Design a protein around this ligand. Structure first.
Ligand SMILES: *[C@@H]1O[C@H](CO)[C@@H](O[C@@H]2O[C@H](CO)[C@@H](O[C@@H]3O[C@H](CO)[C@@H](O)[C@H](O[C@H]4O[C@H](CO)[C@@H](O)[C@H](O)[C@@H]4O)[C@@H]3O)[C@H](O)[C@H]2NC(C)=O)[C@H](O)[C@H]1NC(C)=O
Ligand SMILES: *[C@@H]1O[C@H](CO)[C@@H](O[C@@H]2O[C@H](CO)[C@@H](O)[C@H](O)[C@H]2NC(C)=O)[C@H](O)[C@H]1NC(C)=O
Ligand SMILES: *[C@@H]1O[C@H](CO)[C@@H](O[C@@H]2O[C@H](CO)[C@@H](O)[C@H](O)[C@H]2NC(C)=O)[C@H](O)[C@H]1NC(C)=O
Ligand SMILES: *[C@@H]1O[C@H](CO)[C@@H](O[C@@H]2O[C@H](CO)[C@@H](O)[C@H](O)[C@H]2NC(C)=O)[C@H](O)[C@H]1NC(C)=O
Ligand SMILES: *[C@@H]1O[C@H](CO)[C@@H](O[C@@H]2O[C@H](CO)[C@@H](O)[C@H](O)[C@H]2NC(C)=O)[C@H](O)[C@H]1NC(C)=O
Ligand SMILES: *[C@@H]1O[C@H](CO)[C@@H](O[C@@H]2O[C@H](CO)[C@@H](O)[C@H](O)[C@H]2NC(C)=O)[C@H](O)[C@H]1NC(C)=O
Ligand SMILES: *[C@@H]1O[C@H](CO)[C@@H](O)[C@H](O)[C@H]1NC(C)=O
Ligand SMILES: *[C@@H]1O[C@H](CO)[C@@H](O)[C@H](O)[C@H]1NC(C)=O
Ligand SMILES: *[C@@H]1O[C@H](CO)[C@@H](O)[C@H](O)[C@H]1NC(C)=O
Ligand SMILES: *[C@@H]1O[C@H](CO)[C@@H](O)[C@H](O)[C@H]1NC(C)=O
Ligand SMILES: *[C@@H]1O[C@H](CO)[C@@H](O)[C@H](O)[C@H]1NC(C)=O
Ligand SMILES: *[C@@H]1O[C@H](CO)[C@@H](O)[C@H](O)[C@H]1NC(C)=O
Lengths: 419, 389, 194, 48
């Protein structure tokens, strides 16, 4: 939509209210670890095929080495993303910190699941003769990850408890204790808003935060397509493996796709001519699968590096980068585990309900021009006030907050006023 | 790994452990010999333009019987199968064609040929499965009563027969009376004189057409049964099909007449096993996954074995103890305080520990392993749960 | 020519969804918003403010007092205008500035034509035309002569697709960097060095 | 074509890969350029 506004040379718009918004970001971390047995897949249970395959060199050593490297890299990705602390802080039983209620992101002792309610929601809304019985009969196996779900939940709980009780100070040394409202006041002071705003409107901000978290839970419950970025990662894996199995039904121009049928009717002079086509086709299929897996693993490595950087810069500190840790001025972020990925809840500040005033870049006094040190000068119809950019809180003029530089001859836009 | 020195860690290995010993050769129970007489030792063969066909069923066929007192074979050529494997197969259907030609024409009974005996008399498909047999019969074939078509407008189609005797025109269709120079008779007789050059002598040709499908066999060859041997990696040779695997009772259903069942990857896992008609199930001789944990060859020689996705109750069934060497039975089915059950699988050759440490050799599911001694002053493998801090 | 051969062999180029006019409109919207209101619309509702105020704040971002603009506004405006004109003249004169995009065109086209040329090879067969094989041989040898061509062409297509995927990964990384730089340098002021 | 039908699902895989690349290009352009849902009018004067 068009919102045509032309210009204004002598007007300033300052917002006079704000909202606390929680945004959700999803990032994949790892992928399934798969192993392949060459002899079983290509030859099966025939000795002649094994003897012939012995003559093709060390292709399968290369394939297995590539797959094993990818499998190790996946665990390395998970460890680099999640294990960013040396000690585990115990979850505080009292989950209300000066109003702010962490009821939803820390594990409830009364539930045996030992996970967060949002974590339970996320794990519930990601879903995967038989199909796994045909992969195992042909040499394709899936290996379990080293880190279990309980340890990832423990890492998340320790990070949340540490940032609740000791702020971000535990990412640069030993943890130093500080109450949560003080931490919130510091974070407000980070983005150019005086810390009095939090204290004077503490109850309103606390209720807004709780309502925002509840609405995020509700929106996760309602919309089913929010987590698709993770779901595809599962699907693109499974759809690959199954495809490989179907490739065993092709014949690649031979007389049949069954080795025993070839070996039960033909003499060696034509038996080898028929066998080599099948062997070459199956090698080609396996090589294509490995190359695709390598490319996908590189992409997931890039995603994991991004997730690790985001955990290091938004969860263990406050970032000034624009549109990096959420839409709006950054306040904080919280991590949550999910199958093959992480979900970040970004708590940010959004201005609203603006108002428009007359401006002037300087004020003359005794021929000397005073300029704002940090604020901007506005007029409320009768008096000239100085105000911060991100919020409306005027201050009376004084020599403390303005600086003098030069005379009022080349100054453009200056207005006549007194102190 | 083609080497003699191995560093510490966990490796995934091939089988190299179990091999089949026994053979089972179950075959149908039929005893009637196929009528090779009245086909080879017959008294009359038809002309090439009007050739016969017959079907052979419910009989056993060994070719060694043709060795005793039967004349040799000048031409014996097979296309879809090898002659050395005709005594070990069963065929769903078989058909026999038989006719008489002259010697130089024997070369024409084959795929992708041209000539009077291939375009106007008898044509074979390009994808021909079966065998061709041809032998000389000069002594018995005489006279002037064997015909072959010489004139025809178009060319015949595979396995099609023409038996018409109508005058042939040279510029178009239809010619009632014969005498006019542009009208010819479309048949011609093979002169078979006693004193004639070789290549102008009669030959008898028999064509066998095979068809192998998922259907009951009828023309099986000579084998002997061996009775079933279940729950042992074996060699099985049911009708036609061959392979290796473990055979087990199964409860699936087959659509009445049906021989075997396959999957999306074309892996046979069910056999009708005639003479009992009870459906079985085939499994690979070994499947799943086995890994070996070692602390280094220069450090020690004791290793641990991890079976993945196997619960420590059917290891003697998963790993065939009754078919491995004595050095493997110290593993598998026995417990000298070494069997252990993790979430990753069953670990054999290591003893559990309660204290937590960091991870040296990752096993999985939060379980790690290392090399150390114990209270009895002996080197061993110690498994434990990883410590997160 | 060189395009009728591409279309006669099954290779098609599809047009992009966003037209040039739409991209120009997006750019003009960004420039107008950053010229009349600052970087406010990157964090929420757009708040209008004159350009000198915004660029004085941008002095305040780099540890230099905003009085420098106050006493040297005209010189700053003239320097900016002359810098823009000099950039335009340098664009006119220097021909090797845009080569990074030029490769993206050229090195793409060179792939497709190469693929077409690969249809002239025979890969050890009697000829590179299927009709010649089909009009002179019988299936027993026709199959052997045709499978070589099929395998060679399939391998060529697979190789092309593999390099396409690698190039796509590289261009994805470049596009992600461009998106981040648009978010940070255009919608705000960055403290990162270089 | 009849002989090529026996080669499995290679063409399907190639087509899926190319389609993924094609959609990713449009995603790249949308991510780089489409960042605002409002299109401000070009001001009449171009001298601020
Ligand atoms: C199954 O049977 C049908 C008949 O029931 C048979 O179709 C016949 O095919 C032949 C061609 O092989 C036709 O004969 C041609 O007929 C046309 C029209 O009369 C003539 O012009 C043709 O003469 C020309 O070609 C001759 C050489 O072939 C030359 O000698 C001549 O000078 C001309 O140039 C030729 O006579 C025949 O007409 C039809 N059927 C009828 C009776 O109309 C079919 O081929 C059979 N299929 C099998 C199994 O082969
Ligand atoms: C900013 O907006 C919030 C509402 O989003 C205001 O909070 C309300 O304050 C009034 C009293 O002034 C209460 O009656 C409401 O119940 C509060 N919000 C709600 C809906 O619960 C806040 O006062 C506003 N602040 C400014 C400066 O405008
Ligand atoms: C080998 O050939 C000889 C030819 O005389 C067979 O001899 C007779 O064959 C008929 C039919 O099999 C039998 O009924 C007679 O009893 C046979 N008599 C003799 C001489 O033994 C002989 O049976 C053939 N043996 C085979 C087929 O192995
Ligand atoms: C077929 O062969 C004969 C002998 O070589 C050719 O001679 C013909 O013989 C027939 C039968 O006596 C006559 O009716 C024809 O008039 C003869 N034609 C000629 C000109 O010799 C006959 O031409 C051959 N026919 C063909 C080639 O179709
Ligand atoms: C031939 O095969 C048939 C089955 O197709 C056999 O039938 C049964 O076989 C069992 C074997 O223990 C006998 O106890 C039954 O009495 C048989 N019943 C009938 C109706 O035959 C048959 O016995 C087999 N014969 C041979 C040669 O062993
Ligand atoms: C800077 O802006 C001024 C307008 O304020 C431009 O002045 C005229 O611009 C037009 C082109 O838009 C030229 O054709 C005229 O010759 C300019 N002079 C007049 C009549 O004022 C000026 O060209 C602009 N210069 C720059 C740096 O582009
Ligand atoms: C604002 O515009 C008016 C009309 O052009 C002009 O007289 C005045 O000097 C301008 N002042 C500023 C703030 O540039
Ligand atoms: C946290 O939220 C839960 C669920 O609403 C609530 O039962 C609990 O009392 C809250 N904790 C406090 C005291 O804020
Ligand atoms: C603020 O905007 C309103 C609505 O356009 C207008 O009526 C009012 O005069 C404006 N005041 C200033 C100081 O810009
Ligand atoms: C600012 O304007 C308000 C009315 O909007 C007025 O009530 C207030 O007194 C003014 N500021 C001063 C002079 O205190
Ligand atoms: C057919 O069998 C009889 C009796 O063995 C024999 O005399 C005759 O020569 C045979 N004829 C052949 C082999 O065609
Ligand atoms: C293996 O044992 C575990 C724990 O008793 C059980 O949950 C699982 O179902 C068992 N699986 C098998 C192979 O029976």
């Amino acid at each position: 939509e068009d919102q045509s506004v032309a210009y204004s040379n002598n007007s300033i718009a300052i917002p006079t209210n704000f909202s606390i918004s929680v945004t959700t970001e999803v990032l994949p971390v790892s992928m399934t670890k798969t192993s392949v047995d060459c002899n079983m897949y290509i030859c099966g249970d025939s000795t002649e095929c094994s003897n012939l395959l012995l003559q093709y060199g060390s292709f399968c050593t290369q394939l297995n080495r590539a797959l094993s490297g990818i499998a190790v890299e996946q665990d390395r990705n998970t460890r680099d993303v999640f294990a960013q602390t040396k000690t585990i802080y115990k979850t505080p039983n009292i989950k209300d910190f000066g109003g702010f209620n962490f009821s939803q992101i820390l594990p409830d002792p009364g539930k045996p699941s030992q996970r967060s309610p949002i974590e339970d929601l996320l794990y519930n809304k990601v879903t995967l003769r038989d199909l796994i019985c045909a992969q195992k009969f042909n040499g394709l196996t899936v290996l379990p990850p080293l880190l279990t779900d309980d340890m990832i939940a423990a890492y998340t709980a320790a990070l949340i408890s540490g940032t609740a009780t000791a702020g971000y100070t535990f990412g640069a040394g030993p943890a130093l204790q500080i109450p949560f409202p003080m931490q919130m006041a510091y974070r407000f002071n980070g983005i150019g808003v005086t810390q009095n705003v939090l204290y004077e409107n503490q109850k309103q901000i606390a209720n807004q935060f709780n309502k925002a978290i509840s609405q995020i839970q509700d929106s996760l419950t309602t919309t089913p397509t929010a987590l698709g970025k993770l779901q595809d990662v599962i699907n693109q894996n499974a759809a690959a493996l199954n495809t490989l199995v179907k490739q065993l039904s092709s014949n690649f121009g031979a007389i049949s796709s069954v080795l025993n049928d070839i070996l039960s009717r033909l003499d060696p002079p034509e038996a080898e001519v028929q066998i080599d086509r099948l062997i070459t086709g199956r090698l080609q299929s396996l090589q294509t699968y490995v190359t695709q897996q390598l490319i996908r693993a590189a992409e997931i490595r890039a995603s994991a590096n991004l997730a690790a950087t985001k955990m290091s810069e938004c969860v263990l500190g406050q970032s000034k980068r624009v549109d990096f840790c959420g839409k709006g001025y950054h306040l904080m972020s919280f991590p949550q585990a999910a199958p093959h990925g992480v979900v970040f809840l970004h708590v940010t500040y959004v201005p609203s309900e603006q108002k428009n005033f007359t401006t002037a870049p300087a004020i003359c006094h005794n021929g000397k021009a005073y300029f704002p040190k940090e604020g901007v000068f506005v007029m409320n119809g009768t008096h000239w006030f100085i105000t911060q950019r991100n919020f409306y809180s005027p201050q009376v003029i004084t020599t403390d907050n303005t600086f003098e530089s030069g005379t009022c001859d080349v100054v453009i836009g200056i207005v006549n006023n007194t102190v | 790994t083609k080497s003699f020195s191995v560093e510490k860690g966990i490796y995934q290995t091939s089988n190299f452990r179990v091999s089949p010993s026994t053979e089972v050769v179950r075959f149908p129970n039929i005893t009637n010999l196929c009528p090779f007489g009245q086909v080879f030792n017959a008294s009359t063969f038809p002309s090439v333009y009007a050739w016969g066909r017959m079907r052979i069923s419910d009989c056993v066929a060994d070719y060694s019987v043709l060795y005793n007192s039967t004349s040799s074979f000048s031409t014996f050529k097979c296309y879809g199968v090898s002659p050395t494997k005709l005594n070990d197969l069963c065929f769903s259907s078989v058909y026999a064609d038989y006719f008489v030609v002259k010697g130089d024409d024997v070369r024409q009974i084959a795929p992708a040929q041209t000539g009077v005996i291939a375009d106007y008399n008898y044509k074979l498909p390009d994808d021909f499965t079966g065998c061709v047999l041809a032998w000389n019969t000069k002594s018995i074939d005489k006279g002037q009563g064997f015909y072959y078509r010489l004139f025809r407008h178009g060319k015949i189609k595979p396995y099609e027969r023409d038996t018409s005797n109508v005058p042939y025109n040279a510029q178009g269709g239809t010619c009632t009376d014969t005498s006019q120079l542009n009208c010819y008779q479309p048949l011609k007789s093979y002169d078979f004189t006693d004193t004639v050059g070789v290549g102008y002598q009669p030959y008898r040709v028999v064509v066998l057409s095979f068809e192998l499908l998922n259907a009951p066999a009828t023309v099986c060859g000579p084998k002997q049964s061996t009775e079933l041997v279940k729950n042992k990696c074996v060699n099985f040779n049911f009708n036609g099909l061959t392979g290796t695997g473990v055979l087990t009772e199964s409860t699936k259903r087959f659509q009445s007449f049906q021989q075997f069942g396959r999957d999306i990857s074309d892996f046979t896992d069910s056999v009708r096993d005639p003479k009992t008609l009870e459906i079985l199930d085939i499994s690979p001789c070994s499947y799943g996954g086995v890994s070996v944990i070692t602390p280094g060859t220069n450090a020690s020689n004791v290793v641990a074995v991890l079976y993945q996705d196997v619960n420590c109750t059917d290891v003697p069934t998963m790993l065939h103890t009754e078919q491995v060497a004595h050095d493997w039975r110290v593993y598998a089915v026995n417990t000298d305080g070494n069997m252990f059950q993790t979430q990753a699988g069953c670990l054999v050759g290591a003893t559990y520990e309660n204290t937590s440490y960091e991870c040296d050799i990752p096993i999985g599911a939060g379980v790690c392993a290392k090399f150390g001694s114990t209270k009895t002053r002996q080197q061993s493998i110690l498994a434990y749960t990883m410590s997160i801090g």
